[PDB]
Design a protein around this ligand. Structure first.
Ligand code: MNP
Ligand code: NI
Ligand code: NI
Length: 257
């Protein structure tokens, strides 16, 4: 019984999941001066035209927007990836204050939130099998700063009141995740892990350089969600980010000079 508190937070996770102290944990600080430009890198291909959203779920640590991943409808390819990765869900991580909330940091800078588009490698057949592989997932990470509103986020923000507590879901059809992407697909990439238990080291991370802007009112709505179930004492769903972990013997590559 893990979470983000004083008594069950990231600093405790290693007692149940010793992989917490492993060699390829996420997130990490991206030192922009030591990331190396790689001209081997292929351009990223994001193909979201046929994406079929289904449902939005408060899972007690975040909310997830789930997709139909039973065909190649929304796929990531190229960049550092070999093969085809299917979109399964997106979620966010965010803070109690605008000055924290992202998991990755850039030259020690924390953004207000971070969006994770999670994709699994089709060569493994399903998600459950893919997470057991070192190349099973590809997560596209996008930083959020507070400024102007993001119009393409607003459909997500206005359903949040219907999923306030742990275990609530709502139908969430016809959502187009293209509206959450910044103009540029310049990125950094490195091998890492899930950032929640079970902390599996199955992720190729792809972190976009250009943040999206959201409004103060949009972020505020995220902070009204609850970690608890209905009928349990209220605890606001804030600060659901794991802090930066040691880079160890990894290199972060840049797609851009
Ligand atoms: O890294 C995250 O934010 C956590 C995350 C993401 C997607 C799947 C997960 N899972 O535990 O099966 C966990
Ligand atoms: Ni538990
Ligand atoms: Ni995440």
């Amino acid at each position: 019984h893990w979470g983000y508190g004083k008594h069950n937070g990231p600093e405790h996770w290693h007692k149940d999941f010793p992989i917490a102290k492993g060699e390829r944990q996420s997130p990490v600080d991206i030192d922009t001066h030591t990331a190396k430009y790689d001209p081997s890198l292929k351009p990223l291909s994001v193909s979201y035209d046929q994406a079929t959203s289904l449902r939005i779920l408060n899972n007690g640590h975040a909310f997830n927007v789930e997709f139909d991943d039973s065909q190649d409808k929304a796929v990531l390819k190229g960049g550092p990836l070999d093969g085809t990765y299917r979109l399964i869900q997106f979620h966010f991580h965010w803070g109690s204050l605008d000055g924290q909330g992202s998991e990755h940091t850039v030259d020690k800078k924390k953004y207000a939130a971070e969006l994770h588009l999670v994709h699994w490698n089709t060569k493994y057949g399903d998600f459950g099998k893919a997470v057991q592989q070192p190349d099973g997932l590809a997560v596209l990470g996008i930083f959020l700063k507070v400024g102007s509103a993001k119009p393409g986020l607003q459909k997500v923000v206005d359903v949040l009141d219907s999923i306030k507590t742990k275990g609530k879901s709502a139908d969430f059809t016809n959502f187009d995740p293209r509206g959450l992407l910044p103009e540029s697909l310049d990125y950094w990439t490195y091998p890492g892990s899930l950032t929640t238990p079970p902390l599996l080291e199955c992720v190729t991370w792809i972190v976009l350089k250009e943040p999206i802007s959201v409004s103060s009112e949009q972020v505020l709505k995220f902070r009204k969600l609850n970690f608890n179930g209905e009928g349990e004492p209220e605890e606001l769903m804030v600060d659901n980010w794991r802090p930066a972990q040691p880079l160890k013997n990894r290199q972060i590559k840049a797609s851009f000079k």
